[PDB]
Ligand binder design. Structure first.
Ligand SMILES: NC(=O)c1ccc[n+]([C@@H]2O[C@H](COP(=O)([O-])OP(=O)(O)OC[C@H]3O[C@@H](n4cnc5c(N)ncnc54)[C@H](O)[C@@H]3O)[C@@H](O)[C@H]2O)c1
Ligand SMILES: NC(=O)c1ccc[n+]([C@@H]2O[C@H](COP(=O)([O-])OP(=O)(O)OC[C@H]3O[C@@H](n4cnc5c(N)ncnc54)[C@H](O)[C@@H]3O)[C@@H](O)[C@H]2O)c1
Ligand SMILES: NC(=O)c1ccc[n+]([C@@H]2O[C@H](COP(=O)([O-])OP(=O)(O)OC[C@H]3O[C@@H](n4cnc5c(N)ncnc54)[C@H](O)[C@@H]3O)[C@@H](O)[C@H]2O)c1
Ligand SMILES: NC(=O)c1ccc[n+]([C@@H]2O[C@H](COP(=O)([O-])OP(=O)(O)OC[C@H]3O[C@@H](n4cnc5c(N)ncnc54)[C@H](O)[C@@H]3O)[C@@H](O)[C@H]2O)c1
Ligand SMILES: CC1(C)CCC(Cc2cc(O)c(-c3ccccc3)c(=O)[nH]2)CC1
Ligand SMILES: CC1(C)CCC(Cc2cc(O)c(-c3ccccc3)c(=O)[nH]2)CC1
Ligand SMILES: CC1(C)CCC(Cc2cc(O)c(-c3ccccc3)c(=O)[nH]2)CC1
Ligand SMILES: CC1(C)CCC(Cc2cc(O)c(-c3ccccc3)c(=O)[nH]2)CC1
Ligand SMILES: [Cl-]
Ligand SMILES: [Cl-]
Ligand SMILES: [Cl-]
Ligand SMILES: [Cl-]
Ligand code: NA
Ligand code: NA
Ligand code: NA
Ligand code: NA
Lengths: 268, 268, 268, 268
């Protein structure tokens, strides 16, 4: 009798247990969903993390830059869930930008090969993921991507901002294409979440002045947010993704839902 | 064991059973909610309508232009549900614009007294409703208003578009004020819904060319919408409102969720 | 041989020489324009101010809440400039919100009569000004309003933010109606400008903490702005308004041009 | 005594005399500007087109995908205008997407190498162009890019929409970086312009149904536009770019100005 009871959902993007996708996975299972997970590169590390989830789930290798991985993905998912079953949700929780395109490096100093890799992984793969999973998706199903509001420029985020702007545009076209199968596509735009990478920045991995500066951008996010914002708590985000994966927003597609405490809606 | 299990929700705006709020009410009860209804003016007609809902609920009179009605609302809800029980959600489903400000009358020809009445009922009252209900709202509660995407000008809607632009602005401030009580505020932007008033326009009550033109605007909304749009089916909208009333979007506030088939995200 | 050479332009909203419209007027005359000025209430104070402009211009009384003033405006401009000469531009530089709706008063505590007066003067009057002036406007003419970016809620501005959200909506409809006469309509969204009223706030007329807070909001606007922002310098805003009055943006209408140093495009 | 009198302006993007950059060049020279042109690939064809301009101008080869071309660009511009002179404007009028990413090809069927080439040329090069010309730009100077409103998905434009969404994001970061030199950056979002490529589509180069369909998207653009839209007339666009290159919008940066007849501001 759970929100996602009986739903079969692909969840990409787990690498640690601070991963947003880890908590999407956890909440989805606690809501009654059966999952199929995917991981990139460190497959053994990903299996160990995934065993900490409430329930076991099949894990599949997927490098979104790998054409062969994508071509076979739907075949491998179907064997996972059964030749006759189909997915009801797909969670895109994948991002990447080399340190030349995001960090202390000047914005003009990022070579395009690096930016191009970052946009491939972070934006284009939303479309290629949808292309690879839509043939085995049910009608009324739901594809959800993870966003960080790129409406305005900001320090450090740099070319990852540009990738997110691209991802928002891709989402609207995925919505169009998925719509013919009866499948919705949306993004969830989250506030900052303290992953292990994000702590490293507080710890100084890009400079000590930055750790303070970001620690104060986070305090400013909490100040702007009318209901506050706790960056150590990804659970609100995970619940929002499950909201989109459920049957309760059945006419919403091509859009961005903000799970950020309202901070985007307040000037200061 | 439902989405709004045990939640208490004020629902405003029922006048017919084609009313959007009627279907919000019906879906919310089927999802486990217990309601307090409000109605305006034709109180006996509204009780007749309310008797057709899945479950009984108290009906309170509320003219949002009436300061006395508003001042006493929290006390009268309290007497209905008990001065120890609190509200979990509030649904604003109220709009009005005189015929001078919306329809076939030239845009420049609407007198301000008419526009001001329209904006009072349609936008300001989202703030005065929230002010009158927040004292008896629980933490984590949810306030929801009905919107019609006014980002772009359009024929006929005229000053109601301006009232909706005003309402979107009010919602962000309500979000700020409600946030201190741990209460979220959002709007749902619905596509066209065939109410009795809307059928009158197709039936010609504003010119025969407009009924055709209207009938073709609806077919183009269904064409733009990647997953389609059925204007005779308010249920998708009602479900989305309940999605926002639930506990599954706990970090979302001050925003607009589009329940329009995705039509606003597609140019053509 | 200047930007507005030979153009005739109504300029509203002069009350002091710190008024934005005073600098619009001064720049427009230096660019070659010939003006008709309007003023409200303190007519003798405004003539004293108008005498300080580079060139003489007629002053007409205009209370935008006064239907008689508006009905006669085109005739009175005609008598000023000649019933065979037409206007080339109209500058709306008018705003007002009672202290209950903007400042230190709680957002929920503004009575609607006060909000309605504020929206009448600040937003509706952009439509009624345009309706009263278009009969005597030339093809290719330009109507320009002053805006303050209300996309996001913010402290103090409160119901004036809502009036500005309303004004942006009105501008798109004015654009539609003016378009049949070959007349453009746009808004300029300016950053904070130090008027006499604005200095009063820094000087403490709404609390000492607010003056500091205000003084720091201005320093953060200058920090966000990639090219900086000098709130003691209205000249950039006046130039932008003239840019829109000229013939160099002949396909731009219904939009908002940001004269804010770029601060609205940067998150921090 | 022209709008751009004495200004030195780099203009990229001429390939035919229907090129938007051709008309930007023409209007700029007619406004009193001295130019430096750049061309890609068919250098001899570009020289012949450029000789039809009102005044001669130095032409320089520039392939924005060519690191050596970019590194030397400022050296070659300086030799062109004089070792001691500097640019006052830079016009980015460059776009490209392979036929896999824009046209009749399904959206999901575009390989990333093609999308990546299109985003390199169409979006990233706005940043690399600015990086290569800013060292020789004066304070108060202006960089202008050409945009096509990608806020909503649309048929055919497909991955070029995504590139434009990326370009809008890049523009805001270029505004940030250029701001430290005192240089503004903006985009002009134009309505459809009948280039030779665009006529080919009307002529059937991608299918006859499309030629009618686009011919009717253009008639719909003219209908939405409150002041109309003439796609055979790029002069309004060119004038708008010159508006941004002038001294008259000196506090505008990071933004998009719409030269589209107002069509983006109207729903229908
Ligand atoms: N952390 C935040 O504050 C925050 C805020 C808003 C949005 N987001 C977004 O949420 C998503 C998840 O990021 P996160 O913060 O959980 O960090 P994360 O490092 O835990 O997750 C990113 C994931 O991307 C995967 N990935 C990278 N390259 C890949 C490839 N070639 N193929 C397949 N997978 C690949 C990694 O394996 C990893 O699991 C990203 O899209 C990110 O942009 C994060
Ligand atoms: N019908 C649509 O196509 C559509 C689309 C999008 C949004 N909406 C919005 O949905 C909401 C509900 O409208 P609807 O379409 O269900 O029509 P409706 O006529 O059924 O509901 C509007 C309600 O507002 C009430 N109301 C009017 N004046 C009032 C006052 N002074 N005090 C209190 N209540 C008052 C009426 O009694 C009525 O119940 C409105 O806000 C409307 O703008 C409607
Ligand atoms: N000052 C800023 O920081 C700032 C920033 C952005 C936008 N703006 C806008 O610029 C415009 C000009 O304001 P300002 O800052 O120059 O202040 P101001 O006080 O100098 O100008 C406002 C004008 O509105 C006039 N006005 C008020 N009620 C009127 C009525 N009933 N009829 C006619 N005119 C009436 C006043 O006489 C005054 O001349 C306003 O629309 C304001 O909201 C101001
Ligand atoms: N034509 C329209 O309807 C329209 C509408 C809005 C925006 N725009 C934009 O206006 C700009 C100009 O396009 P146009 O319509 O004038 O067409 P066009 O073909 O005349 O111009 C595009 C230019 O890009 C250049 N280019 C391509 N690859 C290049 C590279 N590697 N290095 C350098 N230059 C390269 C070509 O040489 C050409 O001059 C583009 O950015 C386009 O997206 C066009
Ligand atoms: C300094 C800065 C603006 C603070 C907020 C964070 C939020 C954030 C977004 C984001 O997309 C990511 C991310 C990017 C790529 C791969 C994995 C994760 C992140 O770590 N953090 C981005 C950086
Ligand atoms: C011609 C037009 C654009 C067709 C679509 C409709 C949608 C719509 C919105 C709306 O707010 C209402 C509405 C307004 C006031 C009170 C009750 C309902 C409506 O009836 N219809 C609005 C008019
Ligand atoms: C605290 C706050 C955000 C600082 C910036 C200012 C900018 C501003 C806008 C504005 O519309 C006005 C204004 C309003 C009504 C009449 C005349 C002028 C203003 O004074 N100041 C608005 C208030
Ligand atoms: C069918 C469609 C939406 C009609 C409108 C046009 C407008 C348009 C934009 C545009 O960026 C271009 C373009 C793209 C790449 C290189 C050169 C030019 C174009 O030709 N035409 C784009 C295609
Ligand atoms: Cl590969
Ligand atoms: Cl009353
Ligand atoms: Cl009156
Ligand atoms: Cl190279
Ligand atoms: Na806060
Ligand atoms: Na459709
Ligand atoms: Na700055
Ligand atoms: Na038209």
């Amino acid at each position: 009798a759970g929100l996602l009871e009986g739903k079969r959902i692909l969840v990409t993007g787990i690498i640690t247990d601070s991963s947003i996708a880890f908590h999407i996975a956890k909440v989805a299972q606690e809501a009654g969903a059966e999952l199929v997970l995917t991981g990139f590169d460190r497959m053994k590390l990903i299996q160990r993390i995934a065993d900490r989830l409430p329930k076991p789930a099949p894990l599949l290798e997927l490098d979104v830059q790998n054409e062969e991985h994508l071509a076979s993905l739907a075949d491998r998912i179907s064997g996972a869930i059964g030749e006759g079953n189909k997915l009801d949700g797909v969670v895109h929780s994948i991002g990447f930008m080399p340190q030349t395109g995001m960090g202390v490096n000047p914005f003009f100093d990022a070579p395009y090969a690096d930016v191009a890799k970052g946009i491939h992984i972070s934006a284009y793969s939303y479309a290629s993921l949808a292309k690879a999973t839509l043939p085995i998706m049910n009608e009324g199903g739901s594809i959800v991507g993870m966003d960080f509001d790129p409406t305005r420029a900001m320090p450090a985020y740099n070319w990852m901002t540009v990738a997110k702007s691209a991802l928002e545009s891709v989402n609207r076209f995925v919505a169009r294409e998925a719509g013919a199968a009866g499948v919705r596509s949306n993004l969830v735009a989250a506030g900052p979440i303290r992953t292990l990478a994000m702590s490293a920045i507080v710890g100084g991995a890009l400079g000590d002045e930055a750790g303070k500066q970001m620690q104060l951008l986070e305090e400013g996010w909490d100040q702007r947010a009318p209901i506050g914002w706790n960056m150590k708590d990804p659970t609100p985000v995970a619940k929002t993704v499950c909201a989109l994966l459920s049957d309760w927003m059945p006419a919403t597609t091509g859009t961005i839902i903000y799970a950020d405490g309202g901070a985007s809606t307040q000037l200061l």
